[PDB]
Amino acid sequence: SNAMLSINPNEQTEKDNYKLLTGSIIPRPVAFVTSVTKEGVLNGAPYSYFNIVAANPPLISVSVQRKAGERKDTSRNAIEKGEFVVHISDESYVAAINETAANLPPNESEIELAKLTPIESEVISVPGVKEANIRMECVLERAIPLGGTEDSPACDLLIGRVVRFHVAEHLYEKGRIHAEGLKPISRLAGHNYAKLGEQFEL
Amino acid sequence: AMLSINPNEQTEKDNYKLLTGSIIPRPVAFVTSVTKEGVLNGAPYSYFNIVAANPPLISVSVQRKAGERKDTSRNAIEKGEFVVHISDESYVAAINETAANESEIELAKLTPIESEVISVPGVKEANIRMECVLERAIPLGGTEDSPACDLLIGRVVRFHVAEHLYEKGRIHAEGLKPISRLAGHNYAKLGEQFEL
Ligand SMILES: [Cl-]
Ligand SMILES: [Cl-]
Numbered sequence: 272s273n274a275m276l277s278i279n280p281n282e283q284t285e286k287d288n289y290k291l292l293t294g295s296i297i298p299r300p301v302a303f304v305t306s307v308t309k310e311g312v313l314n315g316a317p318y319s320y321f322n323i324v325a326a327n328p329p330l331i332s333v334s335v336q337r338k339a340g341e342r343k344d345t346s347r348n349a350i351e352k353g354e355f356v357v358h359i360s361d362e363s364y365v366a367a368i369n370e371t372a373a374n375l376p377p378n379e380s381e382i383e384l385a386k387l388t389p390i391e392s393e394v395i396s397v398p399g400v401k402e403a404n405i406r407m408e409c410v411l412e413r414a415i416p417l418g419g420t421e422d423s424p425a426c427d428l429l430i431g432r433v434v435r436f437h438v439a440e441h442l443y444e445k446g447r448i449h450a451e452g453l454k455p456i457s458r459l460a461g462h463n464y465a466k467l468g469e470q471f472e473l
Numbered sequence: 474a475m476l477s478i479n480p481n482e483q484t485e486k487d488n489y490k491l492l493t494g495s496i497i498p499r500p501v502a503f504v505t506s507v508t509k510e511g512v513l514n515g516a517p518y519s520y521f522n523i524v525a526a527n528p529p530l531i532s533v534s535v536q537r538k539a540g541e542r543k544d545t546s547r548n549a550i551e552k553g554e555f556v557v558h559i560s561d562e563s564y565v566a567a568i569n570e571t572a573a574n575e576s577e578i579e580l581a582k583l584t585p586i587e588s589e590v591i592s593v594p595g596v597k598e599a600n601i602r603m604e605c606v607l608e609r610a611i612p613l614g615g616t617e618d619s620p621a622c623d624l625l626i627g628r629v630v631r632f633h634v635a636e637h638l639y640e641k642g643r644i645h646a647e648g649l650k651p652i653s654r655l656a657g658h659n660y661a662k663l664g665e666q667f668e669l
């Protein structure tokens with residue numbers, strides 16, 4: 272009736288802690304993020320460690336993991352350009368988003384691999400993809416290295432300031448977004464995802 | 474067929490509406506914290522997610538009120554500790570009662586429970602909760618003299634998980650029945666799962 276387990280993160284592995292965090296903190300919204308390399312290549316990848324930071328000005332966060340203490344393409348590109356695009360992930364293109372999640376060699380475009388379509392941004396110099404129903408042009412407010420060791424951070428928490436919103440007209444009503452028309456997708460544990468659940472009001 | 478909207482033109486409330494209606498669904502942290510005088514506070518926050526697994530780090534972005542910290546962030550900074558509870562269908566009604574602006578816990582009829590590592594109590598009603606130490610409180614947005622929020626980075630020092638939810642390290646999502654926030658006063662239950 273209330274059997275509770277105590278679990279000490281110091282007494283289990285990183286993978287064990289990962290499984291507990293990703294299974295407990297659910298559902299998670301998924302940012303599909305595009306960024307550009309110094310060589311001009313358009314990268315894209317999904318990140319479920321995504322949320323709002325503030326509305327004044329509009330600030331969002333995406334935590335991008337490092338590989339053995341080194342920044343991933345998305346973080347490197349965001350810091351180098353100071354710009355990136357955050358797209359809302361939805362049922363209409365989640366198949367293509369999933370295709371991007373695989374590991375290409377650096378400086379290969381997951382966007383082109385996944386048959387997605389670049390669309391130039393208005394304020395920033397990093398394109399997004401046309402397939403998204405909502406996307407946000409961002410400038411990088413700060414990148415915060417976190418976790419891991421003094422010398423080898425586990426991740427970089429990217430704080431992005433939205434400088435342009437692009438919203439499908441059919442989703443927009445009096446400043447609000449039709450959640451059931453959007454059909455956002457979310458991430459659970461493992462390779463499980465979730466569609467938007469039944470709504471309720473309090 | 475796409476609208477282009479400059480956030481600098483529209484109002485803070487207009488931007489608030491677009492963010493909260495677009496970045497969905499959001500998991501809801503019910504967070505307890507203690508004042509200098511030992512009063513237990515609790516409030517829900519949907520600007521919540523994982524930061525990293527090594528060590529286990531989480532984030533909660535707590536909005537200010539006219540440039541002043543809310544109780545949760547003031548309390549977290551003073552104590553260096555706080556408890557994050559997963560919000561779920563079995564006690565969302567009580568969680569909602571604590572959003573009101575004394576102890577929110579008593580009001581909402583929730584049940585304090587002492588923590589193992591930290592000195593901030595949690596509530597028994599949660600099926601999953603995480604004792605956290607404060608790593609960072611980062612003021613963001615707003616003006617330099619009036620920030621918009623404090624982004625709290627917590628390190629998990631103890632997990633507490635209902636046994637019926639726990640299967641050799643994994644959590645049964647269907648058993649948990651987590652709740653999520655959408656725009657306005659709208660929430661969502663966990664949706665239909667699929668594999669990728
Ligand atoms: Cl390219
Ligand atoms: Cl990552």
Ligand SMILES: [Cl-]
Pocket residue numbers: 518534535536537
């Ligand atoms: Cl808040």
Ligand SMILES: [Cl-]
Pocket residue numbers: 586587588589591592593594595
């Ligand atoms: Cl305690």
